[PDB]
Amino acid sequence: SGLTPCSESKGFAKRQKNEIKALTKRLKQYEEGSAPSLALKATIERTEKRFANYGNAGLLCGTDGLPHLISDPGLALRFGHAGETLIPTVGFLYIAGWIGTAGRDYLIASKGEAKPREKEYIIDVPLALKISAQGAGWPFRVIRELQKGTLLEKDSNITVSPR
Amino acid sequence: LSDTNLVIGGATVASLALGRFVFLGFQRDNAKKQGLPQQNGQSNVEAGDRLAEEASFALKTNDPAGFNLVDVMAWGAIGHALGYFILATTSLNNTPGFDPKPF
Amino acid sequence: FGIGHTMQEILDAHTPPGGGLGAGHKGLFDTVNNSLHFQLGLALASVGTITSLVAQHMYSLPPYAFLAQDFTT
Amino acid sequence: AGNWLPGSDTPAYLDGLPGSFGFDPFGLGSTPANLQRFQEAELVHSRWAMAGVAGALGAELLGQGDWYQAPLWAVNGGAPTYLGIPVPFNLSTLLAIEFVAIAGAEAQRNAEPDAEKRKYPGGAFDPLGFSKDSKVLEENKLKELKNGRLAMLAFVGFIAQHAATGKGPLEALKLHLADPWGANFATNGVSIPYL
Amino acid sequence: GNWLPGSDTPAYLDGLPGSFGFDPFGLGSTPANLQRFQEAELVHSRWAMAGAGAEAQRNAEPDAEKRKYPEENKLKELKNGRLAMLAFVGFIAQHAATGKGPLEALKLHLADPWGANFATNGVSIP
Amino acid sequence: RLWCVQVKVLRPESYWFNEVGKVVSVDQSGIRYPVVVRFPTVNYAGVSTNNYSLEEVQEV
Amino acid sequence: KAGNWLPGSKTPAYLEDLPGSYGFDPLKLGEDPASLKWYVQSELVHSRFAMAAVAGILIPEVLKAFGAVNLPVWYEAGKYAQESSPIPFNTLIALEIFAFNFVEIKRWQDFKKPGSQGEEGSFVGLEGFFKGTGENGYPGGVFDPLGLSKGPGYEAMKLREIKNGRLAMLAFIGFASQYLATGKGPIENLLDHLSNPLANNFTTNGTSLPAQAHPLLSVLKP
Ligand code: CHL
Ligand code: CLA
Ligand code: CLA
Ligand code: CLA
Ligand SMILES: CC1=C(/C=C/C(C)=C/C=C/C(C)=C/C=C/C=C(C)/C=C/C=C(C)/C=C/C2=C(C)CCCC2(C)C)C(C)(C)CCC1
Ligand SMILES: CC(=O)/C=C/C=C(C)/C=C\[C@H]1[C@H](C)CCCC1(C)C
């Protein structure tokens, strides 16, 4: 996209220098060893580490001097930007499928109780913890339900309004 | 007998011949199955639109195959359009500085 | 004049033979032709989309002389 | 005549058709009218491809150049020649003649109501009487479909190879024969775009 | 007799000419494959002993024995032919492994049986 | 039809259309909607029972 | 059953008769029977691949440590083989894709329909090679040339295959992780551990315990 790597961007370096300069200007009103001086120095150290880490991750920078993320899976894989969006996509989808599968499993298990609504607002905590642990293997079970035909309820069993 | 005469007359003659001998059956049976325009199960004239009566000149022709005047205008229009397309493309490709080819 | 298409038959002909669209477009000629609200809905959807197209194309491809320099306009 | 994927269940509507190996994994032939149209289409594509690949190979093997360079007289200002003999037409005349002739032939073909004749017409199209015996004719249908499928794959191979490498088919065969492990579809920069 | 004395030979192999009971993988377990592979063994052996229109008329007749033989001499042919195909494959492998002809390598083996064989040259064993 | 047999509701305007309830009783005096059905869910009015005709329910 | 992976736990009933079973399925991945059949095949295929790979790494490394051979280390053997390979890289990938597409489709078809690759007319006359045994993951025929599956030690050999397979799978992942963490080969890692086990382990490689997540490492040190 015509961008430049942040490690060679002049705007990126100017932003780091300006942020450090503002924090250092705040620093020269406190004695050394005081709590504000230590806090400001810790913030300065974190700022320097952050700019170094963002340069070293191969992030691309715009004319604004700021990192811009690449999200096309093709451009990310060929040019080393998979850590920006693609790998986070896989991680999010894994955790989200875990959460959804655990919720579905708990609801299905509660459906067979004598008072199914009671487990919805008074949580069966040991059962919930057991089901939550078993959500790690959700893609295998969900794919098997999809091929078997048990993931979905049949259309003849679902209420609909008159058309 | 110029280039304009040749291209326009040849395209018109070829289109009229194609409509008369080749595609007359195909056009005829497609126009038979599609039929008259309808509204609520009736033709437009039966529904009360007097302006939608079928033109009486359009069917009976005295051509042995049934090629009527409307067929002549339609196929001649197609021939004139094709001939002018050929003439215009040739005029573009012969004028220096213009080259529509992709190479 | 005995030539040209009949729209009811065009609509009745366009039904996928695999049954993916059920009866397809059968009967839709009388549905559209008898309903002024169907016709007005179609007209408004198309005209409003065209109005948006006019807006998107007149700023980027200005058709009138000295329009692009008139920023307020 | 066999199974395209041995040990797999095959669609029952394909059983008994000429050239059937049970290949319809997308279920395109589940509709019978569509299956009959597809049979006609496969036969027409097969016969056109067999004639076309035979022309593209034999015209080259007679020193008249590969299939790609055959029409470029019409865009380079040249003139058509058959076996060196000049042909007295321009491109517009060729288009008009081809359109009229093929349109007449295909309009005559389209009018046939009989389903067998839309595929296997015979009559004036079989002047030597190979359709006299059924047992010869049935195996010749399988022969026709297999040869036609091979020719269809061959013509698409002509097109795709010339797109990838820019060479004629016989030159590509010579290049592959000189270095099979180093000159193939995998070693161009096109077919596998990520090496 | 038996290719492996003590091994139990399959029942489909018994009665065939040149049958030492060798079919570990059961390729001839069906009669259709066994009849065609009998022709292939005979043709391979006959071509190895000696080393379109002719091959088309080979399978034009609808018979069974005429495609193979168009009892002692059959076993004699089969035991001689198998040695011939083994010999030809040995010729190909040795000329691939030493670069020399099949006859001079016999003299090289005779002149040095313990220092020149398939073990010594760096092709058959890396 | 039987007492306590599952039935599927076929009345389209019913809240429990396509759902399965339990037959409470069937009136035998020839009234218009004799099948009393109980449901595990309440409708929008908080009601869990409704009466149906014979053709409005299907035994499951 | 071969045992219990966790003594005192309740083992699932659907794993009672499988070879190599210790009742280990806490995530209930094999509760469905079709999934269990597919996973049995997958575990066997992974086991055999890892088995051959760990052999082809360890035996050259052992013979290199003994001074016998000097083959390249496993993580660099791709480079050294490719320069001397007559077949270029792209052709090697295309050939591997074709060959494995063929053999894995044949294996898949046998999984879906057992014995179907050995039926008459299945292969081009050579279908007797691939008759199968009616057992998921144990093809036989060409793949059992010595016929040792017909012997009486067959059931114990199935158990031996799975446990060695699991050990080899863990071993290859250990090879890869040890290379990524230390940059040296596996025999060098073993010798470094044997020289000082307390100080030469994963806790000191600087990668397995990240320093930011474990601040006590920089504190509780001499
Ligand atoms: C299990 C397969 C496998 C693994 C783990 C490796 C690993 C490695 N190889 Mg090798 N290779 C592998 C297979 C192959 N390699 C090569 C040819 C080479 C060369 C020429 C070189 C390497 C080098 C390397 C190292 C460089 C790191 C890298 O580029 O990441 C690759 C990471 C991988 C995990 C390998 C590829 C991904 C995957 C395992 C391939 C197989 C997946 C299946 C095909 C999926 C099929 C799907 C099914 C369901 C249809 C690394 C240790 C090089 C290096 O050390 O530089 C000095 C080096 O120069 N490899 C070929 C020939 C085509 C292989 C064939 O399978
Ligand atoms: C096949 C099993 C196996 C064996 C025998 C070894 C052996 C060794 N490893 Mg490897 N390793 C393995 C698998 C194995 N590893 C797996 C699966 C991983 C990924 C988690 C690793 C990742 C790894 C790293 C990152 C490092 C080692 C290191 C070591 C050394 C021991 C010190 C240590 O840090 O332990 C490793 C600690 C672990 C917690 C891994 C344990 C994994 C196994 C499967 C546990 C099961 C053991 C089993 C119950 C008993 C083993 C008996 C044996 C006869 C098989 C030693 C040479 C260090 C080194 O290379 O040398 C100094 C080192 O830095 N290992
Ligand atoms: C069991 C939990 C669960 C599951 C599996 C689903 C699944 C679904 N939701 Mg439903 N949802 C839930 C809880 C759940 N929802 C709750 C509690 C609410 C009220 C806030 C909603 C409100 C809601 C709306 C308004 C919509 C969906 C839609 C959808 C669909 C698309 C995915 C989505 O849009 O997520 C979005 C989910 C939310 C915005 C709410 C999620 C809240 C948390 C994260 C989930 C609940 C976790 C649960 C408490 C875990 C307990 C388990 C434990 C005891 C073991 C999909 C069918 C959309 C649709 O129908 O698509 C076709 C849609 O428009 N949901
Ligand atoms: C392999 C051969 C083949 C293929 C690929 C097709 C393909 C098609 N045919 Mg069939 N056809 C064939 C052979 C074939 N045809 C033959 C041999 C004949 C006999 C001559 C026909 C006769 C025929 C007729 C008469 C018609 C078709 C039509 C169609 C279309 C719809 C079919 C359908 O069921 O849609 C199924 C569609 C759905 C079930 C609805 C899907 C809706 C999606 C889910 C909505 C998504 C919206 C999205 C989320 C929002 C925007 C996205 C955002 C990113 C912008 C489709 C293009 C129809 C047509 O469309 O013609 C143009 C039609 O009328 N065909
Ligand atoms: C009678 C007869 C006959 C016939 C002949 C004739 C007489 C014919 C004629 C015909 C013709 C001769 C026709 C024509 C037609 C034409 C047309 C009808 C045209 C049209 C046109 C158009 C439509 C155009 C348009 C346009 C324009 C204007 C502009 C540009 C564009 C375009 C081109 C589009 C015959 C011999 C066979 C037989 C006997 C008798
Ligand atoms: C990728 C995409 O575009 C659509 C995919 C979703 C499916 C297959 C929809 C659901 C089916 C499943 C198998 C049963 C319910 C109804 C369906 C349509 C047959």
Side-chain angles (χ1 to χ4, degrees):
Chain A
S1 305
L3 307 164
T4 165
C6 293
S7 67
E8 58 173 271
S9 169
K10 306 205 170 306
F12 199 65
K14 175 198 214 41
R15 283 183 184 279
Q16 183 190 354
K17 174 209 277 282
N18 280 349
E19 278 173 55
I20 291 305
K21 191 180 61 232
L23 286 160
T24 307
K25 151 154 216 308
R26 286 179 62 208
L27 189 55
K28 41 203 55 172
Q29 72 193 116
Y30 303 111
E31 337 286 338
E32 304 239 33
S34 57
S37 185
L38 289 194
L40 285 167
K41 283 156 177 330
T43 303
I44 287 166
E45 160 260 349
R46 269 193 311 276
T47 297
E48 282 153 355
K49 285 184 178 25
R50 167 172 76 249
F51 272 92
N53 290 348
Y54 288 177
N56 292 343
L59 277 159
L60 295 179
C61 266
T63 70
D64 47 5
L66 303 161
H68 292 193
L69 308 188
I70 304 297
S71 67
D72 168 62
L75 291 163
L77 285 168
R78 313 160 56 221
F79 296 109
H81 302 284
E84 295 165 14
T85 307
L86 192 57
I87 303 162
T89 297
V90 175
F92 176 82
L93 284 180
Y94 182 61
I95 302 173
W98 190 326
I99 294 166
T101 306
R104 175 164 191 276
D105 287 347
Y106 185 85
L107 273 199
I108 288 173
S110 300
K111 248 52 163 302
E113 293 319 296
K115 277 178 89 47
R117 292 186 190 98
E118 197 174 82
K119 297 227 164 150
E120 295 201 347
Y121 70 102
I122 300 172
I123 304 301
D124 194 351
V125 171
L127 180 62
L129 285 169
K130 162 150 187 75
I131 282 167
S132 93
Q134 297 179 323
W138 78 265
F140 308 95
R141 296 193 277 106
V142 166
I143 278 196
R144 179 58 209 159
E145 298 190 50
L146 184 56
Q147 321 168 93
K148 193 171 162 203
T150 56
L151 188 71
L152 303 175
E153 192 46 76
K154 280 91 174 76
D155 265 2
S156 84
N157 300 7
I158 310 171
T159 202
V160 281
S161 66
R163 276 86 173 85
Chain B
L1 217 275
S2 81
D3 211 320
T4 298
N5 275 12
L6 205 51
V7 173
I8 293 304
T12 303
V13 154
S15 188
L16 287 168
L18 271 153
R20 173 62 168 75
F21 302 108
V22 180
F23 287 121
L24 189 68
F26 188 69
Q27 197 273 329
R28 249 33 164 181
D29 86 300
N30 278 287
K32 175 88 153 323
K33 302 148 206 270
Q34 291 208 19
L36 294 165
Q38 302 277 291
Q39 40 168 287
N40 298 303
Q42 266 161 349
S43 88
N44 280 321
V45 64
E46 297 169 320
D49 189 12
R50 55 136 193 128
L51 292 166
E53 190 179 8
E54 259 262 14
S56 59
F57 87 100
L59 47 140
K60 176 158 73 73
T61 149
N62 267 336
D63 191 83
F67 213 73
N68 53 65
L69 181 58
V70 180
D71 304 8
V72 172
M73 332 207 69
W75 289 102
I78 294 188
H80 271 56
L82 178 75
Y84 264 107
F85 174 77
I86 290 162
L87 286 174
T89 48
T90 310
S91 174
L92 175 80
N93 281 284
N94 269 68
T95 279
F98 291 137
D99 193 355
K101 298 184 311 289
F103 38 82
Chain C
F1 308 99
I3 61 155
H5 294 260
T6 287
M7 305 181 82
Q8 174 164 274
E9 301 275 9
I10 291 175
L11 284 149
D12 286 17
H14 281 82
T15 147
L21 292 183
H25 296 80
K26 178 208 208 299
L28 274 188
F29 182 86
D30 283 332
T31 298
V32 172
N33 208 37
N34 298 335
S35 170
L36 292 173
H37 292 290
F38 204 120
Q39 299 168 36
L40 186 54
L42 289 176
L44 287 166
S46 320
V47 161
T49 303
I50 282 330
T51 315
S52 276
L53 197 63
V54 163
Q56 304 276 27
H57 288 184
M58 287 194 47
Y59 89 89
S60 50
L61 297 163
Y64 304 134
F66 308 104
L67 171 66
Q69 301 94 315
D70 195 353
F71 303 149
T72 303
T73 294
Chain D
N3 201 340
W4 74 282
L5 178 62
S8 74
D9 264 1
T10 37
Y13 50 81
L14 297 184
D15 299 346
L17 307 188
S20 165
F21 297 96
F23 182 66
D24 189 26
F26 288 178
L28 309 184
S30 64
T31 314
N34 281 10
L35 185 50
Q36 168 57 216
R37 170 189 183 94
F38 291 161
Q39 281 182 293
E40 299 161 20
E42 190 183 41
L43 276 167
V44 169
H45 272 81
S46 292
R47 292 154 175 169
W48 271 119
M50 284 201 270
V53 176
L57 278 204
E60 167 137 76
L61 282 156
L62 289 161
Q64 313 301 316
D66 68 33
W67 65 273
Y68 194 68
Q69 321 273 144
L72 305 163
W73 54 268
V75 305
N76 298 328
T81 47
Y82 192 96
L83 279 170
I85 310 146
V87 179
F89 304 100
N90 66 19
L91 199 278
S92 85
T93 321
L94 298 183
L95 293 195
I97 290 163
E98 155 169 21
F99 183 92
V100 166
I102 301 291
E106 297 270 89
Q108 276 296 350
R109 170 170 78 86
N110 185 235
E112 180 61 42
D114 177 274
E116 203 61 82
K117 285 228 179 79
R118 287 179 80 88
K119 296 179 303 190
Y120 303 108
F125 295 106
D126 195 13
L128 260 47
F130 292 69
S131 62
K132 158 200 132 38
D133 185 73
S134 322
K135 273 183 62 57
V136 197
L137 185 63
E138 289 316 304
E139 95 169 290
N140 273 12
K141 286 161 174 201
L142 177 64
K143 275 149 176 242
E144 185 175 49
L145 272 171
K146 288 169 88 182
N147 274 266
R149 282 154 186 183
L150 184 56
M152 284 198 270
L153 292 173
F155 186 77
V156 153
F158 287 169
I159 305 272
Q161 177 267 307
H162 196 92
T165 76
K167 309 263 171 42
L170 290 202
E171 170 73 290
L173 178 56
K174 252 189 294 292
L175 283 177
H176 178 62
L177 279 165
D179 193 332
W181 314 91
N184 42 70
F185 80 98
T187 57
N188 63 54
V190 177
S191 283
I192 314 179
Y194 315 113
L195 266 39
Chain E
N2 205 314
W3 83 283
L4 213 60
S7 70
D8 304 21
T9 71
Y12 51 80
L13 281 198
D14 283 349
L16 268 68
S19 154
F20 298 104
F22 179 76
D23 212 12
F25 302 141
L27 296 169
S29 173
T30 75
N33 279 349
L34 188 48
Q35 144 77 37
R36 186 201 146 71
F37 292 156
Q38 273 177 81
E39 310 167 38
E41 186 172 47
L42 278 172
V43 169
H44 268 73
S45 62
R46 283 158 184 175
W47 271 110
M49 280 149 143
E55 280 271 276
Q57 284 160 68
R58 239 198 72 231
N59 62 92
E61 83 273 23
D63 221 4
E65 224 72 70
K66 270 178 177 176
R67 327 252 319 270
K68 317 180 258 138
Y69 301 108
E71 333 290 333
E72 161 197 307
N73 279 295
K74 302 202 182 158
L75 165 86
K76 213 168 301 190
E77 182 184 53
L78 270 184
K79 263 154 100 159
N80 265 270
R82 281 154 192 186
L83 184 52
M85 335 184 254
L86 285 180
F88 183 58
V89 167
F91 287 173
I92 283 178
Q94 162 240 292
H95 209 110
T98 66
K100 313 199 77 279
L103 251 195
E104 189 151 348
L106 213 180
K107 193 54 135 193
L108 279 143
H109 182 63
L110 277 187
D112 199 13
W114 309 83
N117 43 330
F118 78 108
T120 45
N121 65 324
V123 169
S124 141
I125 290 172
Chain F
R1 194 71 165 82
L2 192 47
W3 262 42
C4 322
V5 54
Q6 279 186 116
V7 286
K8 175 157 105 133
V9 172
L10 312 179
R11 178 186 287 184
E13 75 259 38
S14 173
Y15 180 88
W16 299 279
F17 175 68
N18 284 329
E19 311 218 318
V20 172
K22 239 79 180 63
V23 174
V24 179
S25 68
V26 181
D27 169 294
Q28 304 300 135
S29 55
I31 62 163
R32 285 177 195 212
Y33 303 95
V35 183
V36 182
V37 188
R38 193 153 281 121
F39 298 98
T41 55
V42 298
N43 66 349
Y44 289 125
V47 182
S48 301
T49 57
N50 202 36
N51 294 1
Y52 297 95
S53 60
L54 292 213
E55 85 267 339
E56 260 163 7
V57 293
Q58 153 195 156
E59 328 215 26
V60 284
Chain G
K1 209 143 85 59
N4 198 339
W5 74 280
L6 189 63
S9 65
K10 303 270 144 33
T11 36
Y14 52 87
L15 307 170
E16 271 305 314
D17 310 59
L18 267 174
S21 161
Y22 293 86
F24 178 71
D25 196 16
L27 288 192
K28 270 80 216 149
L29 302 189
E31 201 160 54
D32 187 69
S35 284
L36 188 51
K37 255 166 45 66
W38 183 254
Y39 297 154
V40 160
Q41 175 106 186
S42 178
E43 190 182 47
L44 282 162
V45 168
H46 272 95
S47 272
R48 291 154 176 167
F49 263 122
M51 213 100 69
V54 165
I57 292 171
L58 243 197
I59 311 194
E61 283 274 22
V62 164
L63 292 176
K64 188 148 104 190
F66 283 4
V69 309
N70 203 83
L71 311 162
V73 80
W74 72 268
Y75 51 83
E76 277 158 16
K79 190 191 50 175
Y80 284 92
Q82 198 45 70
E83 327 268 23
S84 41
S85 144
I87 300 158
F89 188 62
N90 308 338
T91 308
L92 274 184
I93 306 186
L95 289 186
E96 192 172 334
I97 283 178
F98 285 163
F100 260 89
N101 195 70
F102 191 84
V103 300
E104 295 277 77
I105 281 163
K106 286 212 83 61
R107 184 175 63 83
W108 185 45
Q109 261 313 303
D110 180 74
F111 178 82
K112 302 204 273 146
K113 302 260 201 248
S116 74
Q117 301 317 285
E119 305 200 83
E120 170 60 43
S122 152
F123 209 30
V124 57
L126 263 48
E127 55 253 12
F129 272 154
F130 313 115
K131 275 179 280 189
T133 64
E135 302 223 289
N136 174 44
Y138 304 100
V142 253
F143 310 111
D144 188 32
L146 301 194
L148 308 176
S149 54
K150 282 102 92 185
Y154 184 38
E155 296 312 308
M157 280 305 194
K158 279 177 172 177
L159 180 54
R160 271 155 213 169
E161 186 177 47
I162 291 154
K163 286 170 70 178
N164 277 269
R166 292 163 180 175
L167 194 51
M169 286 191 271
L170 294 176
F172 178 75
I173 289 306
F175 287 164
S177 323
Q178 273 158 226
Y179 169 53
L180 291 167
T182 72
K184 331 216 271 204
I187 291 305
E188 307 112 274
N189 292 149
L190 172 60
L191 291 183
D192 275 335
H193 181 61
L194 285 209
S195 75
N196 200 349
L198 296 177
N200 293 7
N201 45 69
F202 76 100
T203 78
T204 62
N205 56 30
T207 300
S208 297
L209 303 177
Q212 259 177 143
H214 304 90
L216 293 179
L217 293 192
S218 43
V219 165
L220 300 174
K221 50 150 201 151

